[PDB]
Amino acid sequence: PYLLISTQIRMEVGPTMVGDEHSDPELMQQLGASKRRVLGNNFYEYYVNDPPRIVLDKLECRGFRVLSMTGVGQTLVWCLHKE
Amino acid sequence: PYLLISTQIRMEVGPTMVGDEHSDPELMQQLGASKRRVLGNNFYEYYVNDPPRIVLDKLECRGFRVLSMTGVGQTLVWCLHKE
Amino acid sequence: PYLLISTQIRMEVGPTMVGDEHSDPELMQQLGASKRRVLGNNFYEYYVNDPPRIVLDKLECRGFRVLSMTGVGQTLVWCLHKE
Amino acid sequence: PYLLISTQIRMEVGPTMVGDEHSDPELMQQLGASKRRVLGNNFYEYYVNDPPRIVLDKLECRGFRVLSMTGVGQTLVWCLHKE
Amino acid sequence: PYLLISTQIRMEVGPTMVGDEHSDPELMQQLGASKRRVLGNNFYEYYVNDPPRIVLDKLECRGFRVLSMTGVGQTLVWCLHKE
Ligand SMILES: [K+]
Numbered sequence: 001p002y003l004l005i006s007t008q009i010r011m012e013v014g015p016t017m018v019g020d021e022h023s024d025p026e027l028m029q030q031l032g033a034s035k036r037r038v039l040g041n042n043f044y045e046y047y048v049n050d051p052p053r054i055v056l057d058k059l060e061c062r063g064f065r066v067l068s069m070t071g072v073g074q075t076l077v078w079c080l081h082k083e
Numbered sequence: 084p085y086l087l088i089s090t091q092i093r094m095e096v097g098p099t100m101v102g103d104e105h106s107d108p109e110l111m112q113q114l115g116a117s118k119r120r121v122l123g124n125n126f127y128e129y130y131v132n133d134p135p136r137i138v139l140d141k142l143e144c145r146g147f148r149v150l151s152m153t154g155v156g157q158t159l160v161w162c163l164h165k166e
Numbered sequence: 167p168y169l170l171i172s173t174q175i176r177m178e179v180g181p182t183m184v185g186d187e188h189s190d191p192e193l194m195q196q197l198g199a200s201k202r203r204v205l206g207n208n209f210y211e212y213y214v215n216d217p218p219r220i221v222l223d224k225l226e227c228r229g230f231r232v233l234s235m236t237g238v239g240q241t242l243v244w245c246l247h248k249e
Numbered sequence: 250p251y252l253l254i255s256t257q258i259r260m261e262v263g264p265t266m267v268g269d270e271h272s273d274p275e276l277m278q279q280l281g282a283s284k285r286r287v288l289g290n291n292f293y294e295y296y297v298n299d300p301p302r303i304v305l306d307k308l309e310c311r312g313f314r315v316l317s318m319t320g321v322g323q324t325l326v327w328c329l330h331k332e
Numbered sequence: 333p334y335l336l337i338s339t340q341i342r343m344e345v346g347p348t349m350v351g352d353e354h355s356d357p358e359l360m361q362q363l364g365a366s367k368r369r370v371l372g373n374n375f376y377e378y379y380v381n382d383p384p385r386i387v388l389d390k391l392e393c394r395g396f397r398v399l400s401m402t403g404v405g406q407t408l409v410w411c412l413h414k415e
Pocket residue numbers: 007008009010011012013014015
């Protein structure tokens with residue numbers, strides 16, 4: 001299984017987006033993530049206020065490892081994987 | 084063999100492009116893809132309504148693995164590979 | 167040795183720039199590549215009219231594998247390697 | 250554990266940002282990094298004036314390896330990992 | 333040790349930046365690099381006229397391998413590593 005998380009520049013602060021409407025609910029909880037819908041968007045998302053680095057470390061503890069990272073617009077995105 | 088899939092940000096929702104007009108039709112069918120031609124294009128494309136994460140998880144079951152991910156414009160691209 | 171190939175978006179269609187004037191003439195021929203200059207082009211380029219995926223697949227048969235992929239401007243670039 | 254460092258082009262000169270305010274102070278101490286808040290921000294950043302190459306080599310000695318690199322806007326970002 | 337090399341699009345031609353002013357002179361010489369300070373730059377840079385592909389191959393000979401590639405602005409950057 002894969003995981004996509006992102007953050008808007010600057011990377012040193014949050015919030016960090018950690019999931020879509022169908023993300024594993026137990027994982028989102030383990031990260032202290034909340035479900036919300038930002039106005040202007042027509043989809044729900046999970047987020048945490050922690051900067052990306054903090055979230056990457058937490059995910060390592062749950063078995064996820066970073067495969068790739070890229071930028072698009074002013075968004076930094078990380079693709080994680082787990083057997 | 085390789086596979087290129089993409090999506091425009093936001094990455095939490097679809098649609099997700101999963102093929103060119105020469106794509107393996109059996110795989111496109113297993114992904115639940117549909118063929119269409121956007122206005123202004125002289126070529127067809129396969130796409131699904133599921134967000135990128137869901138599509139990666141499905142491909143992982145088909146034997147694919149993400150080698151790389153990148154951004155170009157407002158588009159997110161994943162290059163997958165299967166032995 | 168390394169290889170660099172590219173294409174402008176959309177990624178679904180060609181052409182695909184598969185080499186520079188110093189590229190292996192053998193390799194360029196197995197991929198059905200044609201050399202040329204693009205007016206203003208003080209240099210040459212090898213391309214094929216196939217979309218990136220087709221090309222990536224053919225290069226695989228020749229021992230080349232994708233190490234990295236990135237976007238720059240409206241251009242997608244793949245970096246392949248071979249023992 | 251993961252580490253995120255960055256720099257603005259040109260990549261040949263500094264400064265290089267080596268951490269947020271929750272960064273390991275011992276590690277920061279070791280790179281000879283300094284803390285400062287830049288006009289426009291509201292949070293602190295650790296940084297060195299050495300260019301990225303020197304920083305990557307210093308981090309290699311500490312057991313950190315580069316997992317990925319990417320540009321976003323005018324910023325180069327490197328994601329490093331350590332067992 | 334790490335290495336950072338780059339080039340402006342188009343990637344088919346050079347020059348290719350191969351180092352900063354603190355770069356290993358001995359390594360710079362095996363590449364046949366030259367030193368120069370571009371106007372409007374408060375720093376020196378080592379370059380070669382060879383397009384990226386040739387430099388990548390020359391560096392493979394000396395024990396360097398590509399870890400990541402990315403684009404920032406009109407520049408393509410390669411991060412190479414050597415045990
Ligand atoms: K942020």
